[PDB]
């Protein structure tokens, strides 16, 4: 269907304990394929998915170069912004960036994004029209100016429309046997008696991809209220995901309850029972 490639930058200052550490991860869809950590003994961009390993030495030399240059730049960002806000020399401060591009089923650019964040809050983002900036505050507007006068937006649009999309398609191509494929959840129900009067019914979905999923409990064919105990969808470590949903039920009325699961990898919604 539709696909995305995204990069996540993070710079964290550590006053009186070294220079700010810089970390980056690349994703295509729900699949990380790339990483960089400036505290690594030999800071290099590194493969976290099979279909990028094939890339040539020129590629990696290039990516590592950007990462090292990004750590330098973001370190300035931290120092520059720290001044704007006139903050104490006390504790740590953060500068994040997320950028990338979405391509539709046809394979054309749906939209580009390039957001920045200071201390975990929106700071300045490139607008969906890839031409103007949105400043969140007094400081960000100073930054806004600098970028307008320098023509930063145009350069960003170049990469987002062109380079970003090209790479994305290439990766989709080179890693099609896993990127294009959806894995169905393996579902089951567990039975955890609370007391002689109540029991917990927990509905598991395991080993699925991508992470988007829907679990739900019904009684007699109608929804539950109230209510289902979820857990946030969590990685298994093997590139698939996990989720469960539980309900307390009258000890003896287990039959009234069915679990309902919907996921891309299922030809059709599934219905489980105890």
């Amino acid at each position: 269907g539709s696909h995305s490639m995204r990069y996540f930058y993070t710079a964290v200052s550590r006053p009186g304990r070294g220079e700010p550490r810089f970390i980056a991860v690349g994703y295509v869809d729900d699949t990380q394929f790339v990483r960089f950590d400036s505290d690594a003994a030999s800071p290099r961009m590194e493969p976290r998915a099979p279909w990028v390993e094939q890339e040539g030495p020129e590629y990696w030399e290039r990516e590592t170069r950007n990462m090292k240059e990004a750590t330098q730049n973001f370190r300035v960002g931290l120092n520059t912004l720290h001044g704007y806000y006139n903050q104490s020399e006390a504790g740590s401060h953060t500068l994040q960036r997320m950028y990338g591009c979405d391509v539709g089923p046809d394979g054309r650019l749906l939209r580009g994004y390039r957001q920045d964040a200071y201390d975990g809050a929106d700071y300045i983002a490139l607008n969906e029209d890839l031409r103007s900036w949105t400043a969140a505050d007094a400081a960000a507007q100073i930054t806004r100016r600098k970028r307008e006068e320098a023509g930063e937006a145009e350069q960003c649009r170049n990469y987002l429309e062109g380079t970003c999309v090209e790479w994305l398609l290439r990766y989709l191509e080179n890693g099609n046997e896993t990127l294009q494929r959806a894995d169905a959840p393996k579902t089951h129900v567990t039975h955890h008696p609370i007391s002689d009067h109540e029991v917990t019914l927990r509905c598991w979905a395991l080993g699925f991809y991508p992470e988007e999923i829907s679990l739900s409990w019904q009684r007699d064919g109608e929804d539950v209220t109230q209510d289902t105990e979820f857990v946030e969808t969590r990685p298994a470590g093997d590139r698939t995901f996990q989720k469960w949903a539980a309900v307390v039920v009258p000890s003896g009325e287990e039959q009234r309850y069915t679990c309902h699961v919907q996921h891309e990898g299922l030809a059709e919604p599934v219905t489980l029972r105890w």
Binding site: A70, N73, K146, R147, T163
Partner: peptide, 12 residues
């Protein structure tokens, strides 16, 4: 492929 940075797009 990550975004190359230049003196035009590295402002703060």
């Amino acid at each position: 492929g990550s975004q190359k940075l230049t003196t035009g797009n590295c402002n703060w």
